[PDB]
Amino acid sequence: MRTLAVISAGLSTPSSTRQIADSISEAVTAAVSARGEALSVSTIELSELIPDLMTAMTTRVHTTKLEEITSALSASDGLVVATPVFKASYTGLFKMFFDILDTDALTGMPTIIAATAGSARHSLVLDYALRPLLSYMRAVVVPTGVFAATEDFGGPEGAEFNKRIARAAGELASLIVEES
């Protein structure tokens, strides 16, 4: 059985960022299932690690809690990261979790990058911010980034969108089952 790590960084409840994140992981689960394999998904909510993250900034060593999360992340077979859009780019908190990760923490890690906001005017946040981020860490980011614009759900656009979620999931799924 494979493992799927998920990092959602929203601060709301219910969180839109968590929404799309689940739509993607579930889709990935279905895709890995279609390739004849079980998938264990473990979702990490950054809003729930603010204290530990804070500590890792003023201090140098990480809390047992944080240490367990990052070790499990680097052991997962696939990764999906998601984030809301503050100031036309990814969240500060979002970038903080990654600033704390070891240099070789995600090397070779299959990833789906995703963001969300009202409109799609900030969709290039994917290839101009998250992609350069995950690329720096040598993670192989599937070609299909998923930018969820809540204002465009329902109707032909939503069908098209849910269809794009599928492609991304297929892309990641292929990369996950191919691992030895």
> Given the rule CB under 8 A, which residues bind its own copies?
11, 47, 50-51, 53-54, 57-58, 86-99, 108, 119-125, 127-129, 131-133, 135-140, 142-145, 147
Q: How far is the CB of 129 from its own copies (least distance, A)?
A: 8
- Characterize 155-176 residue by residue with b for buried, 16 or more Cβ atoms within 10 angstroms of its Cβ, and e for exposed: eeeeeebeeebbebbbbbbebb
- Give alpha helix (H) positions in 35-63: 50-58
Q: How far is the CB of 112 from its own copies (least distance, A)?
A: 13
Q: How far is the CB of 31 from its own copies (least distance, A)?
A: 17
d(CA 172, CA 167): 9
Q: Which is nearer to its own copies, 38 or 104 (CB)?
A: 104
Q: How far is the CB of 154 from its own copies (least distance, A)?
A: 17
Cα 14–chain centre separation: 17
Q: Which is nearer to its own copies, 24 or 170 (CB)?
A: 170
Q: Which is nearer to its own copies, 1 or 13 (CB)?
A: 13
Q: How far is the CB of 48 from its own copies (least distance, A)?
A: 9
Q: Which is nearer to its own copies, 41 or 80 (CB)?
A: 80
Q: Which is nearer to its own copies, 38 or 50 (CB)?
A: 50
Q: Which long-range contacts (CB under 8 A, 24 or more apart) does 12-17 make?
A: 12/84, 15/45, 15/47, 15/84, 16/84, 16/116, 16/148, 16/150, 17/82, 17/83, 17/84, 17/116
